[PDB]
Structures are given as structure tokens and as C-alpha cells.
Structure 1
Amino acid sequence: NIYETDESVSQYCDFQYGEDCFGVLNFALACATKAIGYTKETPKNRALDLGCATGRASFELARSYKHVDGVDYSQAFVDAATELQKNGCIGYSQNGEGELKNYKVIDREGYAFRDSFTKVEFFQGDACNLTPQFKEYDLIMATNLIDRLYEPRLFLENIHKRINEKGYLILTSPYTWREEYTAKKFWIGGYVDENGKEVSTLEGLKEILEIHFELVATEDIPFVIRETSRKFQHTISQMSVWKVI
């Protein structure tokens, strides 16, 4: 009897574990791979995948880190990651034409990360109010999270407390700020300030983070999300890499 995910969870199962579309590398694999590259001078004892959704990037980080915590606001996402981790498979509904669907099974043993999955622990939790035990990380990776937060500065201005000195914070975002998710006054960029000048999100990130971090690198990373049998979202996130001073 395979655990079956709902429609919201199915979308992220498809995104994180489905076959690559339009020749684009799997996003979680691309992000975890780069993070491992950028943190090559760290001991790689502890990583945090914050906003881990159905957990693919946590599994991928665990191939290099001794221990990886994956945390997500959504209990349903965490349940799906945990079921794949413990029982080895989960089922989901891939979007098709109209209301039509294609049922798919994700088999843990079909991925290279099968050699490391016991090094991950998944938790429900909130990036803006993490419990104190989530600390002493060599790496905190938060991919496509900041423009889903109502007040992203609440996460960003405190996160240095959970990272070891010379450890890394790695963010990605396509900077698609929207009032449905984030109050305009809390957008990190993508707005015209009171003086008429355009504020870029990377500039806003520097202003928040350069108190405790140095900006080491930026890189563009595409991803593709399936909406129907024929319609897809093709987006380019910017990765920014920050080293604790």
C-alpha cells in the first residue's frame, strides 16, 4: 500500500522527483550540487534545507553532509518526504490535460541519493521562528523561499545566529514579489523607493546581510514546473552565496 499525496503535494513531488523538462537539470539537484561546490572549504557536518518541500534537496545534500535537517512550514510536505524516506516510495498525481491526471510512483531506490537517505531528518517548522536546536550549521540553504515569506527580513536578519563562523547561507529566488505573499513594505527589492530609484532585490539582500556576511558569488539557475500536459512555468532563479564573517 503506497502513501498517496494530495494535489498541492503532488505538484512539488512532480517538480522535485519527476523527469527533467526542456533539457533543464532538476532544480533541487542543481542547487544542492552548487551548494556542495561553494562549501568545499567547510567540514560539512551539518546542513539545513529551509523550505525543503518534499525533500529532494535535503536528500541530495546528504550525499556530502554528515547530517541534514529539512524543515518546512507544510506538514503535508514533511509527511511526504518522511514517507519516501521511511517506506521507500510515494504516489502522486501528475497534471495532465484539463482535469486529467497521470498517477506516478516515486521509488527511493531509483535515485543516486538512495545511498545517503538515513542522514536526513525532516521537521515541520517556520523559517521565521525556528526552535533553538536548529543551529551550528555549516550551511543553511533556502531555495525560492524569501519571496514566499510575509516578512522575509524576519528570517534573514537573525539567520546568522544559526550558522558557524565561516559557514554559508545560500539563497535562491526569482524575485517575483507579490502582495499576495509579502507586504509591499517588506519586499526586499523589486520596488521604486520614495525617492524614485529602483531597488534591486540583490541590493536589498546586501543591505540586510552584509552586517554579518560577505557576498561570495551569484549564479542564475533555471527551473521548470509542469502545470498541465502542455503548459509549464520556466523561471530563472538567482542564487546568492553568503559567508559568515
Structure 2
Amino acid sequence: NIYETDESVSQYCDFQYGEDCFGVLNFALACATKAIGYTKETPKNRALDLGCATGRASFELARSYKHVDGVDYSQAFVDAATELQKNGCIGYSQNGEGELKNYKVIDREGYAFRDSFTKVEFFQGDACNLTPQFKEYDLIMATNLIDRLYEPRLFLENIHKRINEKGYLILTSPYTWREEYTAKKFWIGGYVDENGKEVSTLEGLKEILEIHFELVATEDIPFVIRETSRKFQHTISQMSVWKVI
């Protein structure tokens, strides 16, 4: 699992807690902020940050929610988030030219979320088969998760059972389906079906989710993730907001 490697841990520490690039705002804060707004009429007792990686969006959701669970399949990601939460700091290696690295520190006390980090709990877990304790959520937010899932339907077709009535499921994805993560037969979109029609992922999401959800809003949210000091990925993820029916 690439998500268990230290380079991957360092990459997501930088993306989630490092400095903004090319004028693009921090992605985890943008998503959590937009998610809180979309759910402003809800009780805001329990939220789930699914695929939380190094946990930045869990901390941000906890500024508004009474309890936040951060879940990720990578134990390495979970350890890093927990270490920052409990020790108050974590270090990471920022990439430079070639193999060169720059040591950086993330200080929990340098961020506004320092007022709410005890309302978070991080767990290792599988989004496609969550254990029963992860239930009764007002909000379930899964940013850039579905196109990394071995079988996205296992999560999507069942997630409504974990959300309270009038609760929300908020997804984002750039829809970068790849066989290294998901067999083509399981791509939600980005394929030509057996009748020569082009299936968009949002269409495939409507088909799965409109059984139990109403689609409330979509919006494009850019993000930049560093690869080296000179090479970056600059991506436009699509957020979709679903209200339990």
C-alpha cells in the first residue's frame, strides 16, 4: 500500500498542513468549511471524515461538530494524525531537487483547530466495509476517496445506513479512475458502457445515490499537492452534496 509509506505520509502532511501554492487555498480547510456550511441546519453532533489521511479535515470539522471520527485504511496515516493530536507536533520531509529533503515541523498549536482537537478520534478502517460503531452521523465527508476504492459500490450503496435522517453525505473527487486502485468494471464513471454510451462519474453517482439521497449542490474545488520543490499536481476536484431522503 503506497498510503502506508513514509514518503506518502510526508506528502500528505505537506498537502494538509503546509503552505499554499499557486494561489490555491488549503484543500482540507476549504472542504471542511464548505461542508459545515452545507450542513448548517443540522444538529452537528457527529461527523465522519472517511479517508482522512493525516487528519487535517477531521480537526477542522471538530471546530463545529461535537464529535468527529477520522478513519483511514492506512495505519501510517492514522498514526501520524494521532501523533499530532496527542504529542502536539509531528515532523515530515518535504521534497526538493531529486532525492533532496527539507525537514519541516507541524505544530498543532499554530492552527485555529487547536481549540477542538480533543473532539476527534482517529481509527484505521475500511470505507468499503466499516465496522458497526461508525454510525449515526449528521455528516459523512469523503474527499477524494471513491476513485481510490477497490469497489466503490460497497461504500456508496450502504453509506446511507450510517447517516441520520436529514443528514448529509459530502463527496469530492477528480474522477481519476485507474486500474491500480479500482478494476475498470467497478469505475463509477469515465467509461463507455456496453451500449456505446459515455458514463460520467456524477451520472453514475446519481444512479447509486438517488435511491436514498437528494443531490443538493455541486462545486469545483481546486487543490495543489507538491511532488518536488518545482513539480506539483494541480487538480480540480468536484464536490457533490447529498441529503438523506
Question: Do the structures match in fold with TM over 0.5?
Answer: yes
Change (3 A) 1:4 1:156: closer
Change (3 A) 1:115 1:137: same
Maintained 8 Å contact 1:188/1:204: yes
**Deviation (angstroms), 1:194:** 1.2
Query: Matches of 2:89 and 2:198 in 1, distance apart?
Result: 47
Change (3 A) 1:46 1:233: same
Maintained 8 Å contact 2:148/2:181: yes
Maintained 8 Å contact 2:4/2:74: no
Change (3 A) 1:183 1:112: same
SS across alignment from 1:77: helix
Maintained 8 Å contact 2:160/2:244: yes
CA deviation string 1:16-65 (max 9, x = no partner) = 00010111010000000000000001000000000000000000000000
**Deviation (angstroms), 1:188:** 0.3
**Deviation (angstroms), 1:6:** 2.3
**Deviation (angstroms), 1:4:** 14
Query: Matches of 1:205 and 1:127 in 2, distance apart?
Result: 16
Maintained 8 Å contact 1:4/1:92: no
TM-score by length of 1: 0.98
Aligned residues: 245
- Runs of 5+ unmatched residues, structure 2: none
Change (3 A) 1:138 1:2: closer
Please name the residue that 1:205 is paired with.
Answer: 205
Change (3 A) 1:89 1:13: same
Change (3 A) 1:90 1:54: same
**Deviation (angstroms), 1:5:** 8.9
Maintained 8 Å contact 2:27/2:223: yes
Query: Matches of 2:6 and 2:100 in 1, distance apart?
Result: 14
Query: Matches of 2:90 and 2:26 in 1, distance apart?
Result: 19
Change (3 A) 1:4 1:239: closer
Alignment RMSD (CA, Å): 2.8
Maintained 8 Å contact 1:3/1:90: no
Query: Matches of 1:183 and 1:3 in 2, distance apart?
Result: 18
Please name the residue that 1:73 is paired with.
Answer: 73
Maintained 8 Å contact 1:63/1:113: yes
Runs of 4+ in 1 over 2 A off after TM superposition: 1-6
Maintained 8 Å contact 2:3/2:9: no
- Runs of 5+ unmatched residues, structure 1: none
TM-score by length of 2: 0.98
Change (3 A) 1:188 1:137: same
Maintained 8 Å contact 2:226/2:232: yes
Query: Matches of 1:6 and 1:244 in 2, distance apart?
Result: 38
Maintained 8 Å contact 1:3/1:89: no
**Deviation (angstroms), 1:8:** 1.6
